[PDB]
């Protein structure tokens, strides 16, 4: 129970459905635990407070 210093491991995240017409098929994907993000290229918080 403590905050890690060295970097960890990731699935990693991947983008998928966005537009107003999909027609998906559900083929493949990862049975392994993964992560899927809706918006492309987010993670915006560049301010560092010393």
């Amino acid at each position: 129970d403590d905050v890690g210093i060295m970097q960890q491991k990731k699935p990693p995240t991947v983008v998928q459905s966005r537009t107003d017409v999909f027609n998906e098929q559900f083929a493949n994907e990862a049975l392994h635990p993964m992560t899927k993000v809706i918006f492309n290229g987010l993670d915006v918080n560049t301010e560092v407070q010393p």
């Binding site: 890690g4 060295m6 970097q7 960890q8």
Partner: peptide, 27 residues
């Protein structure tokens, strides 16, 4: 140092055929 890793080990087993000795023990 940089990335946290993982290693593996297995307890080893060492044996030779019973050697011959020329020295006696008891009377």
């Amino acid at each position: 140092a940089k990335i946290a890793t993982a290693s593996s080990a297995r307890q080893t087993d060492v044996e030779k055929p019973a050697d011959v000795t020329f020295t006696i023990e008891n009377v």
